[model samples]
Target: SVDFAFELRKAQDTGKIVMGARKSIQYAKMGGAKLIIVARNARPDIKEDIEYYARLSGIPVYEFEGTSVELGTLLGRPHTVSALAVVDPGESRILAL
Candidate 1:
Protein backbone atom coordinates (compact mmCIF):
# COMPACT_ATOMS: atom_id res chain seq x y z
CA SER A 1 0.00 0.00 0.00
CA VAL A 2 1.06 3.59 -0.55
CA ASP A 3 2.47 5.22 2.52
CA PHE A 4 0.09 8.16 2.57
CA ALA A 5 1.05 8.53 6.17
CA PHE A 6 4.53 9.45 5.01
CA GLU A 7 3.17 11.55 2.19
CA LEU A 8 1.26 13.59 4.71
CA ARG A 9 4.50 14.23 6.53
CA LYS A 10 6.26 15.29 3.37
CA ALA A 11 3.30 17.44 2.45
CA GLN A 12 3.49 19.04 5.83
CA ASP A 13 7.11 19.90 5.29
CA THR A 14 6.83 21.04 1.70
CA GLY A 15 3.26 22.20 1.19
CA LYS A 16 1.05 25.11 2.07
CA ILE A 17 -1.65 23.89 4.40
CA VAL A 18 -4.53 25.29 6.39
CA MET A 19 -5.84 23.73 9.56
CA GLY A 20 -9.32 23.29 11.13
CA ALA A 21 -12.47 21.56 9.84
CA ARG A 22 -14.50 24.72 9.72
CA LYS A 23 -11.73 26.42 7.80
CA SER A 24 -11.64 23.53 5.38
CA ILE A 25 -15.38 23.82 4.81
CA GLN A 26 -15.05 27.52 4.22
CA TYR A 27 -12.10 26.99 1.92
CA ALA A 28 -14.15 24.45 -0.01
CA LYS A 29 -16.90 26.97 -0.51
CA MET A 30 -14.42 29.62 -1.48
CA GLY A 31 -13.21 27.17 -4.14
CA GLY A 32 -9.54 27.70 -3.44
CA ALA A 33 -8.59 24.42 -1.86
CA LYS A 34 -6.88 21.65 -3.77
CA LEU A 35 -7.70 18.95 -1.27
CA ILE A 36 -9.56 18.45 1.96
CA ILE A 37 -8.17 15.95 4.45
CA VAL A 38 -9.76 14.87 7.65
CA ALA A 39 -9.55 12.21 10.26
CA ARG A 40 -12.47 9.78 10.07
CA ASN A 41 -13.48 10.82 13.56
CA ALA A 42 -12.96 14.50 13.01
CA ARG A 43 -16.23 15.53 14.47
CA PRO A 44 -19.71 14.20 15.09
CA ASP A 45 -21.29 15.77 12.00
CA ILE A 46 -18.52 17.91 10.57
CA LYS A 47 -17.28 15.18 8.24
CA GLU A 48 -20.65 14.98 6.51
CA ASP A 49 -20.78 18.72 6.17
CA ILE A 50 -17.21 19.01 4.87
CA GLU A 51 -17.58 16.20 2.34
CA TYR A 52 -20.78 17.64 0.94
CA TYR A 53 -19.37 21.09 0.33
CA ALA A 54 -15.96 19.81 -0.75
CA ARG A 55 -17.47 17.57 -3.42
CA LEU A 56 -19.95 20.23 -4.36
CA SER A 57 -17.09 22.64 -4.90
CA GLY A 58 -15.33 19.98 -7.01
CA ILE A 59 -12.41 19.40 -4.70
CA PRO A 60 -11.24 16.04 -3.45
CA VAL A 61 -11.69 15.07 0.15
CA TYR A 62 -9.36 12.53 1.71
CA GLU A 63 -10.57 10.68 4.74
CA PHE A 64 -7.68 9.28 6.66
CA GLU A 65 -7.91 5.71 7.92
CA GLY A 66 -5.97 6.53 11.02
CA THR A 67 -7.05 8.21 14.22
CA SER A 68 -6.94 11.98 14.66
CA VAL A 69 -4.04 11.61 17.02
CA GLU A 70 -2.13 9.49 14.56
CA LEU A 71 -2.81 11.98 11.81
CA GLY A 72 -1.32 14.70 14.00
CA THR A 73 1.66 12.53 14.79
CA LEU A 74 2.23 11.87 11.12
CA LEU A 75 2.02 15.57 10.46
CA GLY A 76 4.78 16.04 13.03
CA ARG A 77 2.59 17.79 15.53
CA PRO A 78 2.30 17.07 19.20
CA HIS A 79 -1.39 17.89 19.47
CA THR A 80 -4.34 16.46 17.54
CA VAL A 81 -5.60 17.15 14.05
CA SER A 82 -9.11 16.58 12.82
CA ALA A 83 -9.23 18.53 9.58
CA LEU A 84 -6.96 20.44 7.25
CA ALA A 85 -6.53 21.61 3.70
CA VAL A 86 -3.71 21.24 1.24
CA VAL A 87 -3.99 24.65 -0.32
CA ASP A 88 -0.76 24.02 -2.13
CA PRO A 89 1.29 20.85 -2.40
CA GLY A 90 4.47 22.81 -3.02
CA GLU A 91 7.12 20.19 -3.89
CA SER A 92 5.27 17.28 -2.31
CA ARG A 93 3.62 14.76 -4.59
CA ILE A 94 0.85 13.98 -2.16
CA LEU A 95 -1.80 14.19 -4.84
CA ALA A 96 -0.46 10.98 -6.38
CA LEU A 97 2.42 10.28 -4.07
Candidate 2:
Protein backbone atom coordinates (compact mmCIF):
# COMPACT_ATOMS: atom_id res chain seq x y z
CA SER A 1 0.00 0.00 0.00
CA VAL A 2 1.31 3.43 -0.86
CA ASP A 3 -0.27 4.73 2.31
CA PHE A 4 1.81 2.27 4.29
CA ALA A 5 5.13 3.48 2.88
CA PHE A 6 4.17 7.13 2.93
CA GLU A 7 2.94 7.05 6.48
CA LEU A 8 5.92 5.05 7.68
CA ARG A 9 8.38 7.42 6.07
CA LYS A 10 6.43 10.35 7.42
CA ALA A 11 6.67 8.94 10.91
CA GLN A 12 10.40 8.49 10.52
CA ASP A 13 10.97 11.97 9.17
CA THR A 14 8.96 13.55 11.96
CA GLY A 15 10.95 11.58 14.53
CA LYS A 16 7.87 9.91 15.91
CA ILE A 17 9.26 6.41 15.66
CA VAL A 18 11.89 4.45 17.52
CA MET A 19 13.62 1.44 15.95
CA GLY A 20 14.97 -1.85 17.41
CA ALA A 21 13.67 -4.60 19.66
CA ARG A 22 15.06 -3.30 22.94
CA LYS A 23 13.64 0.21 22.64
CA SER A 24 10.41 -1.19 21.34
CA ILE A 25 10.12 -3.48 24.35
CA GLN A 26 11.07 -0.57 26.54
CA TYR A 27 8.18 1.36 25.07
CA ALA A 28 5.88 -1.64 25.16
CA LYS A 29 6.02 -1.90 28.93
CA MET A 30 5.83 1.85 29.43
CA GLY A 31 3.13 2.44 26.81
CA GLY A 32 5.43 4.63 24.81
CA ALA A 33 5.15 2.61 21.65
CA LYS A 34 1.78 4.10 20.70
CA LEU A 35 1.83 1.70 17.79
CA ILE A 36 4.34 -1.04 17.04
CA ILE A 37 5.64 -2.44 13.76
CA VAL A 38 7.55 -5.71 13.66
CA ALA A 39 9.35 -7.09 10.64
CA ARG A 40 8.06 -10.48 9.56
CA ASN A 41 11.57 -11.86 9.41
CA ALA A 42 12.62 -10.69 12.83
CA ARG A 43 14.17 -13.19 15.23
CA PRO A 44 11.65 -15.42 16.96
CA ASP A 45 12.68 -14.53 20.48
CA ILE A 46 12.67 -10.84 19.76
CA LYS A 47 9.31 -11.06 18.07
CA GLU A 48 7.87 -12.96 21.00
CA ASP A 49 9.22 -10.48 23.47
CA ILE A 50 7.73 -7.49 21.67
CA GLU A 51 4.41 -9.19 21.11
CA TYR A 52 4.18 -10.22 24.75
CA TYR A 53 4.79 -6.80 26.19
CA ALA A 54 2.83 -5.02 23.50
CA ARG A 55 -0.19 -7.11 24.39
CA LEU A 56 0.31 -6.67 28.11
CA SER A 57 0.46 -2.91 27.75
CA GLY A 58 -2.40 -2.75 25.26
CA ILE A 59 -0.10 -1.51 22.51
CA PRO A 60 -1.18 -2.06 18.93
CA VAL A 61 1.28 -4.12 16.92
CA TYR A 62 1.40 -4.09 13.13
CA GLU A 63 3.23 -7.04 11.68
CA PHE A 64 5.36 -5.72 8.85
CA GLU A 65 4.88 -8.13 5.98
CA GLY A 66 8.23 -6.92 4.73
CA THR A 67 11.51 -8.41 5.87
CA SER A 68 13.85 -6.63 8.25
CA VAL A 69 15.93 -5.55 5.29
CA GLU A 70 12.90 -4.10 3.61
CA LEU A 71 11.93 -2.27 6.73
CA GLY A 72 15.36 -0.71 7.10
CA THR A 73 15.41 0.26 3.46
CA LEU A 74 12.04 1.86 3.83
CA LEU A 75 13.51 4.03 6.53
CA GLY A 76 16.43 4.90 4.25
CA ARG A 77 18.89 2.87 6.27
CA PRO A 78 21.42 0.30 5.20
CA HIS A 79 21.24 -1.72 8.43
CA THR A 80 18.26 -3.66 9.73
CA VAL A 81 15.50 -3.23 12.25
CA SER A 82 13.52 -5.93 14.02
CA ALA A 83 10.80 -3.50 15.02
CA LEU A 84 9.82 0.14 15.32
CA ALA A 85 7.40 1.81 17.67
CA VAL A 86 5.78 5.18 17.57
CA VAL A 87 6.89 7.67 20.12
CA ASP A 88 4.27 9.99 18.65
CA PRO A 89 2.49 9.65 15.35
CA GLY A 90 2.84 13.32 14.46
CA GLU A 91 0.97 13.80 11.17
CA SER A 92 1.16 10.21 10.01
CA ARG A 93 -1.93 8.02 9.94
CA ILE A 94 -0.25 4.65 10.42
CA LEU A 95 -2.22 4.51 13.67
CA ALA A 96 -5.35 3.21 12.01
CA LEU A 97 -6.22 1.03 14.95
lDDT of 1 by residue, 1-97 (tens): 5578767777778888887888888999999889889897788677998888988999898888888898888877898889889989877777773
Off by over 4 Å in 1: none
The whole-model lDDT of each prediction reads 0.83, 0.89
Off by over 4 Å in 2: none
| Top TM-score model | 2
Q: Candidate 1: lDDT over CA atoms?
A: 0.83
Distance (Å) between predicted and true CA of 94, model 1?
1.2
- Residue 71's lDDT within candidate 2 is 97
Question: Which whole-number lDDT from 0 to 100 does residue 45 have in model 2?
Answer: 88
Residue 36 lDDT (model 2): 93
